[PDB]
Curated annotation (Swiss-Prot), chain A:
Record-listed N6-acetyllysine modification sites: 84
Residues of the full protein shown: 637 to 917 of 953
Role noted for this protein: Component of the 26S proteasome, a multiprotein complex involved in the ATP-dependent degradation of ubiquitinated proteins. This complex plays a key role in the maintenance of protein homeostasis by removing misfolded or damaged proteins, which could impair cellular functions, and by removing proteins whose functions are no longer required. Therefore, the proteasome participates in numerous cellular processes, including cell cycle progression, apoptosis, or DNA damage repair.
Subunit relationships: Component of the 19S proteasome regulatory particle complex. The 26S proteasome consists of a 20S core particle (CP) and two 19S regulatory subunits (RP). The regulatory particle is made of a lid composed of 9 subunits, a base containing 6 ATPases and few additional components including PSMD1. Interacts with ADRM1. Interacts with ZFAND1.
Family designation: Belongs to the proteasome subunit S1 family.
PC repeats: 15-49, 50-90, 93-125
Name of the protein in its database record: 26S proteasome non-ATPase regulatory subunit 1
Species name: Homo sapiens (Human)
Coiled-coil parts of chain: none
UniProtKB/Swiss-Prot annotation, chain B:
Range covered out of full length: 39 to 140 of 418
Name of the protein in its database record: 26S proteasome regulatory subunit 6B
Subcellular location: Cytoplasm; Nucleus
Oligomer status and interactors: Component of the 19S proteasome regulatory particle complex. The 26S proteasome consists of a 20S core particle (CP) and two 19S regulatory subunits (RP). The regulatory particle is made of a lid composed of 9 subunits, a base containing 6 ATPases including PSMC4 and few additional components. Interacts with NR1I3. Interacts with PAAF1. Interacts with TRIM5. Interacts with ZFAND1.
Its job: Component of the 26S proteasome, a multiprotein complex involved in the ATP-dependent degradation of ubiquitinated proteins. This complex plays a key role in the maintenance of protein homeostasis by removing misfolded or damaged proteins, which could impair cellular functions, and by removing proteins whose functions are no longer required. Therefore, the proteasome participates in numerous cellular processes, including cell cycle progression, apoptosis, or DNA damage repair.
Family: Belongs to the AAA ATPase family.
From Swiss-Prot, chain E:
Protein name, per record: 26S proteasome non-ATPase regulatory subunit 3
Lineage, opening ranks: Eukaryota, Metazoa, Chordata, Craniata, Vertebrata
Positions of region (Disordered): 1-52, 483-508
Disulfide bond annotation, renumbered to this chain: none
Compositional bias annotation for Pro residues: 1-15
GO cellular component: cytosol; extracellular exosome; extracellular region; ficolin-1-rich granule lumen; membrane; nucleoplasm; nucleus; proteasome accessory complex
Source taxon at top rank: Eukaryota
Keywords associated with the record: Isopeptide bond, Phosphoprotein, Proteasome, Ubl conjugation
Curated annotation (Swiss-Prot), chain F:
Tissue: Expressed in limb bud, craniofacial primordia and skin.
Stated name of the protein: 26S proteasome complex subunit SEM1
Location in or out of the cell: Nucleus
Keywords per UniProt: Nucleus, Proteasome
Chief localization: nucleus
Record keyword Nucleus present: yes
One of the protein's GO biological processes: proteasome assembly
Signal sequence, renumbered to the chain: none
Gene: SEM1
Lineage: Eukaryota, Metazoa, Chordata, Craniata, Vertebrata
The organism of origin for this protein: Homo sapiens
Family as reported in the entry's similarity comment: Belongs to the DSS1/SEM1 family.
Subunit structure: Component of the 19S proteasome regulatory particle complex. The 26S proteasome consists of a 20S core particle (CP) and two 19S regulatory subunits (RP). The regulatory particle is made of a lid composed of 9 subunits including SEM1, a base containing 6 ATPases and few additional components. Belongs to the TREX-2 complex (transcription and export complex 2), composed of at least ENY2, GANP, PCID2, SEM1, and either centrin CETN2 or CETN3. Component of the homologous recombination repair (HR) complex composed of ERCC5/XPG, BRCA2, PALB2, DSS1 and RAD51. Interacts with the C-terminal of BRCA2.
Cellular component GO terms held in the UniProt record: cytosol; integrator complex; nucleoplasm; proteasome complex; proteasome regulatory particle, lid subcomplex; protein-containing complex
Keyword Nucleus on entry: yes
Length: 231, 102, 153, 39, 508, 40
């Protein structure tokens, strides 16, 4: 599609960016960010816009260690929304890209795909219906079906929360946060409760609870909810 | 594993067959597309045409002319002009506003 | 030179002719490569005892000259003399077509098995599960996990 | 055979990869020049 | 001793100076960039290997006092060459034996000492899996033995060194040649060692064993890989079968490997000659004079004495068979003064209409034409001489007696000069009638061959071909098209200034 | 480059065509015509 980013029309140049934005949005694709880097430079307002939409979808819940272009683009949405001489269509992808980029407090994410291999069809309908903001603006408000969490949940009975506190092993900077600035010696053992967010790339870096009273009967590989056998 | 080494490799021939035919479409497709653009540009040489006189060029296809208004300009030119038709002291044609060679 | 006595009409000199078709099948292999192909004459003849080995050496010489399925039909119809050796750079030549026509036919047998199926020449599937047991017994199960898909069975 | 039926199929395909690939390589830049002339 | 001591010690380090940067760089690139990386994209050690042939073709002549090549073998055979922590000492070992040549005395390899220079696939962790290293470190001593050849107590050392390289060649024939240029990189080494192999182990030894070994080498060729084994194994098959009279010309007709697909313009170039003499001995019907001409025009700038004499002779030898002849001796460089005079003296008789003048050549240099072995093709030219004569006279005179042409053609018999003339009518050549009763052979005046549609065919042969060479001047042309990075339309910030000042004039 | 295996080892051209045709023919005319004067 990078070859199609140089079409002589800005329509196919426009749809190329949303093609990457629907393909690689679950990944911090360094290649796709590399392709979307000059896509904001085009003299057409709506492909500058869709460059910001796909630039928002590529890096949700990604803090600076999946790819360093996150904070390269945080300054960029403010950079284009704080100009007066821009297009409303231009900065519209930025005011859009904020509510996309900080969705749910970095607790929800997109997923057109289960761990099982099956696709997540209401997220599929949510993104296809999300494409047609052209001819109705709250038509792409049908997006909440795409928002899916990234959190493990432990459980032992039909209702009772357990008290499990496991940790991690790998580089702990991956557990970075948004951390707003609000202007008017390193722990890798991240202890977690039952409703704790975790990156799917951080599902492999955690430690299983081996010292708690609880032990998971299931091998912990997916997030969501599992039985956590009290031992 | 040796088993994926042939199936995944005929997978990309099965993928690869749709690229040379597909741009083989584009050997003619931007010919028949391009000729739409080719005669399209000449609208500027409509009829409200003012007259300059060619003086010299800095480089290929960007030049300096002497207008019949008395002043001189650094102008651009139409590409289809045979450049070897230029310069006895060439009576040239200028756009009245954008002020380039016609 | 031994090609000259292929008109003896005594079923012992055909046998003696094929005595010299396996050890010396690299020099006048060039000679009888395109001129004489009377393998199918004695092979289809009622003269037995000498047709069994005849399709072997035609499967040798027709292999290298592009007559691959020609070497494959004679490869099937050559018999017990044919599959007796897997200690050469030649078993690689013949199972490359046998398991080829096997599984590319077995795609159509994944299409319509019921009716108009394979008239197998009883080794076309026999060396399949034979060498597949060699996969099962030569400790390789990254390929025993794979040829069991290759059969589509 | 895997060594001597199945590895006999890696030896054949790669030749079609390398030259039909290369024909595509020539043809795409051949289009790309024309795209430059277009825009 | 000052004379030896002032001209002999600089030879050793300056060949060491070039050999630490040509094939120590082929050591660092052809083993780490082919056995471990791609060499099909980077095949420069093939032509670098050509260079390490060419420099060493005329690099060594002498019996090597001061151990300037004879001390290289105790130097360069002690090689692990496994990995950089095992070759960082080998880079020192390129220097340490200079003290063995210079401070001490090394082992003077003089026709006897090659055996302790051969048994190192074991000494200090030498291997056989890096056959880009062990075939190059096979060839690199397999060359300088057999380069000067030294047929005095060197044929068995050469021979056993060929046995070791043949063990590497069998490991090449059997053991993991896929995608490594184990096969491909050592088809050049195998191919070039076929010539020293073929210049000790052909004419001095039995070639007919290398026939069946070469049929096996061709059998493992074309299955696993179709390049570089499809090429050399066929001229290298051809070169003594042509010298023989074996059937393998028609086997070369029915052969599949007749095309080896762009065989590197050296084997490919000569290959067309090697198939040209095939239809020479099997009766040129003007089929292969284009493949002789093509073999000639694909031949390089080196010297004519190699084979370019013999394609320069044989190329026309087949057109003397047709009847056509140009001036051959037009480029008197190093070819058109030495080896022509019997052969241009031959066609000097052919350009005459004389009969026994051909015999006056054929006795004069019957043996010189047997020195090459063309004489069986030379012997059949009396036919084209006499057809040259009958086209000459039949074109010249019109109503001429047959009782004149036997005497003028010194045929000594008019009674069958009815019959040579008669078959000259029969086979095509001349048309009109003989008054066999009278004796004059009349000939009609056939003019206006233009409206006869022959020169339209003389066009259309060349119309199509000239269109084709324009097509090839197109197809060879479009590789350049590259580095076309960005078709930038105008700008971005100056477009913002254009809409800015445009907004000023629009509010204005 | 140029290894080139060895199995064996104007001013000229207008002169070469007139060498072709003008090859072996009487070489020395000052006397041939002067002896055809009385014989012919």
């Amino acid at each position: 599609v990078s070859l199609l980013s140089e079409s002589y029309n800005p329509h196919v140049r426009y749809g190329a960016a949303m093609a990457l934005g629907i393909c690689c949005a679950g990944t911090g694709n360094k290649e796709a960010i590399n392709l979307l880097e000059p896509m904001t430079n085009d003299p057409v307002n709506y492909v500058r816009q869709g460059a910001l939409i796909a630039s928002a979808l590529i890096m949700i819940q990604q803090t600076e260690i999946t790819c360093p272009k996150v904070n390269q683009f945080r300054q960029l949405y403010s950079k284009v929304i704080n100009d007066k001489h821009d297009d409303v269509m231009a900065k519209f992808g930025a005011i859009l890209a904020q509510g996309i980029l900080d969705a749910g407090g970095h607790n929800v994410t997109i997923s057109l795909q289960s761990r099982t291999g099956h696709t997540h069809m209401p997220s599929v309908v949510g993104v296809l219906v999300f494409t047609q903001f052209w001819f109705w603006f709250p038509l792409s408000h049908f997006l909440s079906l795409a928002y899916t969490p990234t959190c493990v949940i432990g459980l032992n009975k039909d209702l009772k929360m357990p008290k499990v506190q496991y940790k991690s092993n790998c580089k702990p900077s991956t557990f970075a946060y948004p951390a707003p600035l609000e202007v008017p010696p390193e722990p890798n053992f991240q202890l977690l409760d039952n409703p704790a967010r975790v990156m799917p790339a951080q599902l492999k870096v955690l430690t299983m609870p081996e010292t708690c009273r609880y032990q998971p009967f299931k091998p912990l590989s997916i997030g969501g909810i599992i039985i956590l056998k009290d031992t | 594993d040796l088993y994926s080494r042939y199936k995944k490799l005929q997978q990309e021939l099965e993928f690869l067959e749709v690229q040379e035919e597909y741009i083989k479409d584009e050997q003619k497709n931007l010919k028949k597309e391009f000729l739409h653009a080719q005669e399209e540009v000449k609208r500027i040489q409509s009829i409200p045409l003012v007259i300059g006189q060619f003086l010299e060029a800095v480089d290929q296809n960007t030049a300096i002319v002497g207008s019949t208004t008395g002043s001189n300009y650094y102008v651009r030119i139409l590409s289809t002009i045979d450049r070897e038709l230029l310069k006895p002291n060439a009576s040239v044609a200028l756009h009245k506003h954008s002020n380039a060679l016609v | 030179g031994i090609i000259s006595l292929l008109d003896e009409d005594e079923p012992q000199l055909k046998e003696f002719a094929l005595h010299k078709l396996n050890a010396v099948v690299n020099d006048f292999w060039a000679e009888i490569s395109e001129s004489v192909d009377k393998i199918e004459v004695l092979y289809e003849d009622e003269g037995f005892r000498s047709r069994q080995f005849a399709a072997l050496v035609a499967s040798k010489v027709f292999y290298h000259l592009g007559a691959f399925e020609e070497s494959l039909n004679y490869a099937l119809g050559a018999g017990d003399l044919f599959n007796v050796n897997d200690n050469s750079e030649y078993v690689e030549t013949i199972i490359a077509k046998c398991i080829d026509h096997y599984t590319k036919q077995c795609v159509e047998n994944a299409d319509l098995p019921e009716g108009e199926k394979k008239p197998i020449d009883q080794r076309l599937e026999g060396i399949v599960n034979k060498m597949f047991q060699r996969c099962l017994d030569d400790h390789k199960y990254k390929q025993a996990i794979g040829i069991a898909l290759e059969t589509r069975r | 055979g895997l060594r001597q039926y199945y590895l006999s199929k890696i030896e054949e395909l790669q030749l079609i990869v390398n030259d039909k690939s290369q024909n595509l390589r020539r043809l795409q830049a051949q289009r790309n020049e024309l795209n430059a002339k277009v825009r | 001793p000052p004379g030896g001591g002032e001209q002999e010690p600089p030879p050793p380090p300056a060949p060491q100076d070039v050999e630490m940067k040509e094939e120590a760089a082929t050591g660092g690139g052809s083993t780490g960039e082919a056995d471990g990386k791609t060499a099909a994209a980077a095949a420069e050690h093939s032509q670098r290997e050509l260079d390490t042939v060419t420099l060493e073709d005329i690099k060594e002549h002498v019996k090597q006092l001061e151990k300037a090549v004879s001390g290289k073998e105790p130097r360069f055979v002690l090689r692990a060459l496994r990995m950089l922590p095992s070759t960082s000492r080998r880079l020192n070992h390129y220097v340490l034996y200079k003290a063995v040549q210079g401070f001490f005395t090394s082992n003077n390899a003089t026709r006897d000492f090659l055996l302790p220079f051969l048994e190192e696939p074991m000494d200090t962790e030498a291997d056989l899996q890096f056959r880009p290293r062990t075939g190059k470190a096979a060839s690199t001593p397999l060359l300088p033995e057999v380069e000067a050849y030294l047929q005095l107590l060197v044929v068995i050392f050469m021979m056993n060194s060929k046995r070791y390289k043949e063990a590497q060649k069998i490991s090449d024939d059997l053991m993991q040649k896929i995608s490594t240029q184990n096969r491909r990189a050592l088809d050049l080494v195998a191919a070039k060692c076929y010539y020293y192999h073929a210049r000790v182990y052909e004419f001095l030894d039995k070639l007919d064993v290398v026939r069946s070994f070469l049929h096996a080498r061709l059998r493992t060729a074309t299955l696993r890989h179709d390049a570089d084994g499809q090429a050399t194994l066929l001229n290298l098959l051809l070169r003594n079968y042509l010298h023989y009279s074996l059937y393998d010309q028609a086997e070369k007709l029915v052969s599949k490997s007749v095309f080896p697909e762009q065989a590197n313009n050296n084997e490919w170039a000569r290959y067309l000659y090697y198939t040209g003499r095939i239809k020479a001995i099997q009766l040129e019907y003007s089929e292969a004079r284009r493949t002789m001409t093509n073999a000639l025009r694909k031949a390089p700038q080196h010297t004519a004495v190699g084979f370019k004499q013999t394609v320069h002779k044989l190329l026309i030898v087949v057109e003397l068979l047709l009847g056509e002849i140009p001036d051959r001796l037009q480029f008197r460089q190093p070819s058109l003064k030495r080896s022509l005079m019997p052969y241009f003296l031959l066609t000097q008789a052919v350009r005459t209409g004389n009969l026994a003048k051909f015999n006056q050549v054929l006795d004069q240099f019957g043996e010189k034409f047997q020195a090459d072995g063309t004489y069986t093709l030379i012997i059949r030219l009396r036919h084209n001489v006499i057809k040259t004569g009958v086209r000459m006279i039949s074109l010249s005179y019109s109503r001429i007696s047959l009782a004149d042409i036997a005497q003028k053609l010194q045929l000594d018999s008019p009674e069958d000069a009815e019959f040579i003339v008669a078959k000259a009518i029969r086979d095509g050549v001349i048309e009109a009638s003989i008054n066999h009763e009278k004796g004059y052979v009349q000939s009609k005046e056939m003019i206006d061959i233009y409206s006869t549609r022959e020169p339209q065919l003389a066009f259309h042969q060349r119309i199509s071909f000239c269109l084709d060479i324009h097509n090839m001047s197109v197809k060879a042309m479009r590789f350049p098209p590259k580095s076309y990075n960005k078709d930038l339309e105008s700008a971005e910030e100056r477009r913002e200034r254009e809409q800015q000042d445009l907004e000023f004039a629009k509010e204005m | 480059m140029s290894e080139k295996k060895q199995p064996v080892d104007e001013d000229n051209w207008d002169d070469d065509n007139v060498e072709d045709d003008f090859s072996n023919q009487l070489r020395a005319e000052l006397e041939k015509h002067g002896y055809k004067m009385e014989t012919s």
